[PDB]
Amino acid sequence: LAMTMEHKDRPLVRVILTNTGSHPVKQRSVYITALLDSGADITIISEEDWPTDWPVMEGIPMRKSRDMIELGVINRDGSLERPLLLFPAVAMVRGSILGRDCLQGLGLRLTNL
Amino acid sequence: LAMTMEHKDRPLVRVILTNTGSHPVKQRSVYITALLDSGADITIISEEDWPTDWPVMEAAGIPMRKSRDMIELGVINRDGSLERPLLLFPAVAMVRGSILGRDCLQGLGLRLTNL
């Protein structure tokens, strides 16, 4: 992944979220879009992007996913980045955010070199 | 500027702010610390970090003012070397630390990449 930072374009990517828990869910993997945000310590899925039967456990009022989620970043040309596993936060936010826990899993750096 | 994204450590840089302003102020230049934020559209200096006598004006989800004076912004690298300065009118707001938004990430020529 390589994206230039521009004031006008939000650094957005497509993402595949997969629930790896035991219990049945209506849809085990969904596609969403999310912002690459070096300003967030953790990844937060918005309530509108989160499947209603994916359970959550209990400034910003947030819950954490109870099941482990596999997150795959999909690039603008459809190529896949390495999948990561985490327990994301779920909150009532504008759009989903990929924080530094995912930016570091992806090996990213901010650079003009 | 090259900074690795790490979960535990915020990507912070030292910045010097200079009021280039047409009126007097106690301090013309101040050193602050700010976060490189690919998720913010605009640069915001915290109210805690903003010199008390540098004027602000209202502008036209947090309430923010705008600097009245043009500010010169110099980003300092970890080894003390300076990036080319930028000129802007930053937003001032009650936030958790100053943030350099994509308006200044684009002025420095940054790219987000793992290649």
Curated annotation (Swiss-Prot), chain A:
Residues 32-102 form the Peptidase A2 domain. The active site is at D37 (for protease activity). Aspartyl protease that mediates proteolytic cleavages of Gag and Gag-Pol polyproteins during or shortly after the release of the virion from the plasma membrane. Cleavages take place as an ordered, step-wise cascade to yield mature proteins. This process is called maturation. Displays maximal activity during the budding process just prior to particle release from the cell. Active as a homodimer. This is Protease p15. It comes from Rous sarcoma virus subgroup C (strain Prague). The chain holds residues 578 to 701 of 701 of the full protein.
